[PDB]
Amino acid sequence: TKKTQLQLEHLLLDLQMILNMLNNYDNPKLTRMLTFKFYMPKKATELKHLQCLEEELKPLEEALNQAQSDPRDLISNINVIVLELKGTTFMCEYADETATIIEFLNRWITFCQSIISTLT
Ligand SMILES: [Mg+2]
């Protein structure tokens, strides 16, 4: 339904802001930002695969908390949107390799645009 398209766009904008918050703030800890490793979904083609994102929302916040600029507010709005799109409690599978926070955000930003392109 269109209600599903709206919520993904809301989710896309929040993910869009976090990615733009790192690609414009370069001086603060180019060191520390590239060291966090996030677990990637094996296959992200269905709407239920947001379980792989929900479980990493808390580690995403702890990485953003080390950058002073509000991270706690953005992660909460992301959490409520994810809980309204994937919701059975399915067993999400992860890839073997970990990725950077930049690659992690681009993966789910691409995921939302992929599902938003599917519904339209
Ligand atoms: Mg890698």
XYZ file of N, CA, C and O and ligand atoms in Angstrom:
481
model
N 0.824 -1.203 0.000
C 0.000 0.000 0.000
C 0.862 1.258 0.000
O 2.080 1.190 0.173
N 0.218 2.410 -0.203
C 0.933 3.679 -0.132
C 1.438 3.955 1.279
O 2.480 4.600 1.448
N 0.712 3.481 2.297
C 1.162 3.631 3.677
C 2.541 3.017 3.886
O 3.327 3.515 4.700
N 2.855 1.945 3.155
C 4.185 1.356 3.242
C 5.225 2.216 2.532
O 6.377 2.287 2.976
N 4.841 2.874 1.434
C 5.772 3.758 0.739
C 6.127 4.969 1.594
O 7.288 5.393 1.627
N 5.137 5.543 2.283
C 5.392 6.712 3.121
C 6.390 6.400 4.229
O 7.317 7.179 4.478
N 6.222 5.259 4.899
C 7.070 4.937 6.040
C 8.508 4.663 5.614
O 9.450 5.004 6.339
N 8.699 4.049 4.445
C 10.052 3.845 3.937
C 10.725 5.169 3.600
O 11.926 5.339 3.842
N 9.971 6.117 3.039
C 10.539 7.429 2.745
C 10.913 8.158 4.029
O 11.959 8.812 4.093
N 10.063 8.070 5.056
C 10.437 8.605 6.361
C 11.720 7.956 6.861
O 12.620 8.640 7.361
N 11.820 6.631 6.725
C 13.038 5.925 7.109
C 14.217 6.334 6.237
O 15.349 6.448 6.723
N 13.974 6.546 4.941
C 15.050 6.938 4.039
C 15.642 8.285 4.433
O 16.867 8.454 4.436
N 14.788 9.257 4.769
C 15.278 10.585 5.127
C 16.133 10.543 6.386
O 17.162 11.224 6.469
N 15.717 9.761 7.386
C 16.501 9.672 8.612
C 17.857 9.032 8.340
O 18.884 9.506 8.839
N 17.880 7.952 7.554
C 19.152 7.361 7.153
C 19.949 8.322 6.283
O 21.183 8.346 6.348
N 19.258 9.121 5.467
C 19.936 10.099 4.625
C 20.639 11.157 5.467
O 21.714 11.641 5.098
N 20.050 11.520 6.610
C 20.642 12.559 7.448
C 21.891 12.063 8.165
O 22.881 12.795 8.267
N 21.861 10.831 8.677
C 23.034 10.284 9.353
C 24.206 10.168 8.386
O 25.353 10.471 8.739
N 23.941 9.729 7.152
C 25.017 9.607 6.173
C 25.576 10.974 5.798
O 26.792 11.132 5.636
N 24.702 11.974 5.658
C 25.150 13.333 5.381
C 25.802 13.979 6.596
O 26.569 14.935 6.440
N 25.512 13.477 7.798
C 26.121 14.015 9.008
C 27.575 13.587 9.151
O 28.347 14.273 9.830
N 27.962 12.476 8.523
C 29.331 11.975 8.568
C 30.160 12.443 7.378
O 31.360 12.695 7.523
N 29.543 12.557 6.200
C 30.266 12.936 4.994
C 30.563 14.428 4.933
O 31.353 14.851 4.083
N 29.955 15.228 5.808
C 30.275 16.645 5.916
C 31.164 16.962 7.110
O 31.972 17.894 7.034
N 31.038 16.214 8.206
C 31.950 16.327 9.345
C 33.125 15.389 9.098
O 33.038 14.185 9.349
N 34.231 15.943 8.603
C 35.421 15.170 8.264
C 36.478 15.211 9.359
O 37.037 14.170 9.720
N 36.767 16.403 9.887
C 37.788 16.540 10.925
C 37.531 15.670 12.151
O 38.465 14.975 12.590
N 36.319 15.644 12.754
C 36.145 14.870 13.994
C 36.300 13.370 13.808
O 35.422 12.707 13.242
N 37.416 12.836 14.295
C 37.675 11.399 14.349
C 37.423 10.712 13.008
O 36.531 9.874 12.869
N 38.226 11.083 12.007
C 38.347 10.226 10.833
C 38.918 8.874 11.237
O 38.557 7.835 10.670
N 39.805 8.880 12.233
C 40.209 7.697 12.982
C 39.028 6.837 13.406
O 38.815 5.748 12.868
N 38.252 7.334 14.369
C 37.333 6.479 15.109
C 36.156 6.028 14.254
O 35.632 4.926 14.457
N 35.736 6.851 13.291
C 34.553 6.518 12.505
C 34.799 5.304 11.621
O 33.923 4.442 11.478
N 35.985 5.213 11.026
C 36.309 4.116 10.126
C 36.626 2.816 10.855
O 36.845 1.797 10.192
N 36.658 2.817 12.189
C 36.993 1.612 12.937
C 35.780 0.796 13.364
O 35.923 -0.404 13.616
N 34.601 1.404 13.463
C 33.411 0.651 13.841
C 32.998 -0.316 12.740
O 32.939 0.049 11.561
N 32.705 -1.551 13.133
C 32.293 -2.596 12.211
C 30.847 -2.972 12.482
O 30.469 -3.238 13.629
N 30.044 -2.970 11.426
C 28.631 -3.289 11.501
C 28.368 -4.578 10.739
O 29.001 -4.843 9.710
N 27.438 -5.378 11.249
C 27.079 -6.632 10.604
C 26.053 -6.372 9.511
O 25.067 -5.661 9.726
N 26.289 -6.952 8.350
C 25.529 -6.741 7.133
C 24.534 -7.870 6.903
O 24.800 -9.025 7.251
N 23.376 -7.559 6.322
C 22.409 -8.615 6.008
C 22.892 -9.456 4.838
O 23.508 -8.950 3.897
N 22.606 -10.757 4.905
C 22.970 -11.644 3.805
C 22.140 -11.341 2.564
O 22.676 -11.229 1.455
N 20.828 -11.200 2.735
C 19.916 -10.921 1.633
C 18.876 -9.924 2.115
O 18.164 -10.194 3.087
N 18.795 -8.776 1.448
C 17.845 -7.721 1.797
C 16.988 -7.424 0.569
O 17.200 -6.434 -0.134
N 16.009 -8.296 0.319
C 15.066 -8.135 -0.778
C 13.617 -8.055 -0.325
O 12.765 -7.631 -1.113
N 13.314 -8.453 0.905
C 11.962 -8.467 1.433
C 11.837 -7.440 2.552
O 12.831 -6.987 3.125
N 10.591 -7.077 2.860
C 10.357 -6.057 3.876
C 10.702 -6.561 5.271
O 11.060 -5.762 6.144
N 10.612 -7.874 5.498
C 10.901 -8.426 6.816
C 12.384 -8.374 7.157
O 12.737 -8.463 8.338
N 13.256 -8.223 6.158
C 14.694 -8.181 6.402
C 15.139 -6.947 7.178
O 16.345 -6.786 7.400
N 14.215 -6.077 7.595
C 14.588 -4.966 8.459
C 14.957 -5.430 9.861
O 15.494 -4.631 10.638
N 14.668 -6.690 10.203
C 15.164 -7.255 11.454
C 16.677 -7.113 11.546
O 17.224 -6.878 12.630
N 17.370 -7.254 10.410
C 18.820 -7.100 10.399
C 19.231 -5.669 10.723
O 20.339 -5.441 11.222
N 18.358 -4.699 10.442
C 18.631 -3.308 10.786
C 18.283 -3.011 12.239
O 19.024 -2.295 12.922
N 17.158 -3.551 12.720
C 16.727 -3.294 14.092
C 17.787 -3.706 15.103
O 18.071 -2.966 16.052
N 18.385 -4.882 14.913
C 19.359 -5.386 15.872
C 20.644 -4.567 15.896
O 21.356 -4.589 16.905
N 20.958 -3.846 14.821
C 22.152 -3.013 14.773
C 21.877 -1.544 15.070
O 22.801 -0.728 14.989
N 20.637 -1.185 15.412
C 20.339 0.210 15.722
C 21.045 0.661 16.994
O 21.470 1.819 17.097
N 21.170 -0.231 17.981
C 21.866 0.150 19.209
C 23.364 0.328 18.982
O 23.925 1.325 19.470
N 24.074 -0.572 18.283
C 25.480 -0.277 17.953
C 25.656 0.945 17.070
O 26.677 1.636 17.187
N 24.700 1.230 16.181
C 24.792 2.438 15.366
C 24.755 3.686 16.233
O 25.473 4.658 15.969
N 23.931 3.670 17.282
C 23.822 4.825 18.165
C 25.105 5.044 18.957
O 25.549 6.185 19.120
N 25.717 3.965 19.451
C 26.943 4.106 20.232
C 28.096 4.637 19.387
O 28.999 5.294 19.917
N 28.088 4.363 18.081
C 29.096 4.954 17.209
C 28.822 6.436 16.987
O 29.748 7.256 17.004
N 27.555 6.794 16.771
C 27.188 8.195 16.597
C 27.307 8.988 17.894
O 27.503 10.208 17.853
N 27.199 8.324 19.049
C 27.315 9.029 20.323
C 28.712 9.584 20.559
O 28.866 10.516 21.355
N 29.726 9.035 19.902
C 31.088 9.524 20.058
C 31.384 10.739 19.186
O 32.544 11.160 19.106
N 30.369 11.310 18.540
C 30.514 12.496 17.701
C 29.578 13.573 18.234
O 28.353 13.414 18.187
N 30.151 14.662 18.737
C 29.376 15.750 19.318
C 28.930 16.715 18.227
O 29.743 17.161 17.411
N 27.639 17.037 18.218
C 27.083 17.958 17.234
C 25.780 18.572 17.734
O 24.780 17.875 17.906
N 21.343 15.604 17.052
C 21.294 14.696 18.193
C 21.100 13.252 17.744
O 20.115 12.931 17.080
N 22.048 12.383 18.106
C 21.959 10.985 17.649
C 20.831 10.208 18.304
O 20.171 9.407 17.630
N 20.597 10.414 19.605
C 19.562 9.654 20.303
C 18.180 9.888 19.708
O 17.345 8.976 19.705
N 17.917 11.094 19.202
C 16.598 11.397 18.654
C 16.397 10.735 17.295
O 15.296 10.266 16.982
N 17.446 10.698 16.469
C 17.318 10.124 15.133
C 17.172 8.608 15.185
O 16.396 8.029 14.415
N 17.913 7.945 16.076
C 17.831 6.489 16.165
C 16.463 6.047 16.674
O 15.951 4.997 16.264
N 15.839 6.838 17.551
C 14.510 6.493 18.050
C 13.467 6.540 16.938
O 12.650 5.622 16.802
N 13.478 7.607 16.131
C 12.537 7.698 15.019
C 12.773 6.594 13.995
O 11.822 6.125 13.359
N 14.025 6.168 13.820
C 14.304 5.035 12.943
C 13.749 3.751 13.546
O 13.190 2.905 12.838
N 13.875 3.596 14.866
C 13.433 2.371 15.522
C 11.929 2.170 15.380
O 11.468 1.059 15.093
N 11.146 3.233 15.572
C 9.695 3.094 15.503
C 9.240 2.803 14.077
O 8.257 2.081 13.868
N 9.945 3.335 13.077
C 9.557 3.087 11.691
C 9.875 1.650 11.297
O 9.096 0.997 10.592
N 11.020 1.134 11.748
C 11.383 -0.249 11.449
C 10.394 -1.209 12.097
O 9.972 -2.198 11.485
N 9.996 -0.926 13.341
C 9.063 -1.796 14.046
C 7.681 -1.819 13.404
O 6.908 -2.747 13.666
N 7.355 -0.835 12.565
C 6.055 -0.782 11.911
C 6.067 -1.336 10.493
O 4.999 -1.445 9.882
N 7.234 -1.684 9.954
C 7.326 -2.194 8.590
C 7.559 -3.697 8.531
O 6.945 -4.379 7.705
N 8.425 -4.234 9.390
C 8.653 -5.673 9.420
C 7.610 -6.417 10.244
O 7.504 -7.643 10.123
N 6.850 -5.713 11.077
C 5.931 -6.355 11.999
C 4.527 -6.498 11.447
O 4.258 -7.384 10.635
N 6.539 -10.740 11.033
C 6.720 -11.578 12.212
C 8.132 -11.425 12.765
O 8.951 -10.693 12.208
N 8.413 -12.124 13.865
C 9.742 -12.112 14.475
C 10.585 -13.187 13.792
O 10.836 -14.269 14.327
N 11.025 -12.871 12.578
C 11.757 -13.815 11.748
C 13.252 -13.752 12.050
O 13.773 -12.747 12.541
N 13.942 -14.851 11.751
C 15.359 -14.999 12.077
C 16.194 -14.397 10.953
O 16.400 -15.022 9.910
N 16.684 -13.180 11.171
C 17.536 -12.530 10.186
C 18.905 -13.195 10.130
O 19.481 -13.558 11.159
N 19.421 -13.364 8.916
C 20.740 -13.938 8.700
C 21.721 -12.835 8.325
O 21.361 -11.879 7.631
N 22.961 -12.981 8.779
C 24.005 -11.988 8.590
C 25.088 -12.517 7.662
O 25.271 -13.727 7.505
N 25.816 -11.587 7.051
C 26.963 -11.976 6.255
C 28.147 -12.276 7.169
O 28.159 -11.920 8.350
N 29.153 -12.946 6.604
C 30.341 -13.273 7.386
C 31.206 -12.042 7.618
O 31.755 -11.859 8.712
N 31.339 -11.191 6.607
C 32.173 -10.004 6.706
C 31.393 -8.823 7.269
O 30.191 -8.669 7.035
N 32.108 -7.986 8.014
C 31.613 -6.733 8.559
C 31.994 -5.577 7.638
O 32.877 -5.697 6.784
N 31.318 -4.443 7.825
C 31.512 -3.286 6.962
C 31.604 -2.023 7.806
O 31.299 -2.019 9.002
N 32.038 -0.941 7.161
C 32.156 0.347 7.824
C 30.773 0.956 8.045
O 29.768 0.503 7.490
N 30.730 2.004 8.873
C 29.467 2.698 9.106
C 28.974 3.356 7.823
O 27.762 3.444 7.586
N 29.895 3.806 6.968
C 29.506 4.398 5.690
C 28.861 3.349 4.792
O 27.776 3.563 4.238
N 29.523 2.200 4.633
C 28.960 1.124 3.826
C 27.670 0.588 4.430
O 26.759 0.190 3.694
N 27.571 0.579 5.762
C 26.357 0.107 6.419
C 25.166 0.995 6.082
O 24.087 0.502 5.735
N 25.345 2.314 6.180
C 24.251 3.231 5.875
C 23.871 3.173 4.401
O 22.683 3.206 4.062
N 24.863 3.082 3.510
C 24.566 3.004 2.083
C 23.798 1.737 1.735
O 23.010 1.733 0.783
N 24.007 0.659 2.493
C 23.317 -0.593 2.203
C 21.820 -0.467 2.451
O 21.005 -0.891 1.622
N 21.439 0.119 3.588
C 20.026 0.246 3.926
C 19.373 1.430 3.226
O 18.172 1.381 2.935
N 20.132 2.495 2.955
C 19.619 3.565 2.102
C 19.293 3.013 0.721
O 18.246 3.326 0.140
N 20.177 2.168 0.184
C 19.888 1.494 -1.076
C 18.709 0.542 -0.924
O 17.900 0.391 -1.847
N 18.591 -0.102 0.240
C 17.479 -1.017 0.470
C 16.147 -0.286 0.392
O 15.214 -0.741 -0.280
N 16.040 0.856 1.077
C 14.789 1.607 1.068
C 14.448 2.073 -0.341
O 13.319 1.891 -0.810
N 15.425 2.651 -1.043
C 15.193 3.073 -2.420
C 14.828 1.891 -3.306
O 14.101 2.056 -4.292
N 15.321 0.695 -2.976
C 14.983 -0.478 -3.772
C 13.543 -0.910 -3.525
O 12.846 -1.326 -4.458
N 13.079 -0.824 -2.278
C 11.701 -1.205 -1.991
C 10.739 -0.098 -2.414
O 9.633 -0.373 -2.894
N 11.146 1.167 -2.256
C 10.324 2.281 -2.724
C 10.195 2.248 -4.238
O 9.146 2.602 -4.790
N 11.241 1.800 -4.933
C 11.152 1.637 -6.377
C 10.282 0.445 -6.750
O 9.739 0.408 -7.859
N 10.143 -0.525 -5.846
C 9.309 -1.693 -6.105
C 7.828 -1.362 -5.968
O 7.013 -1.794 -6.791
N 7.465 -0.593 -4.939
C 6.066 -0.256 -4.702
C 5.514 0.743 -5.711
O 4.296 0.787 -5.911
N 6.366 1.544 -6.344
C 5.894 2.528 -7.315
C 5.794 1.926 -8.714
O 4.926 2.303 -9.502
Mg 34.516 -5.383 4.317
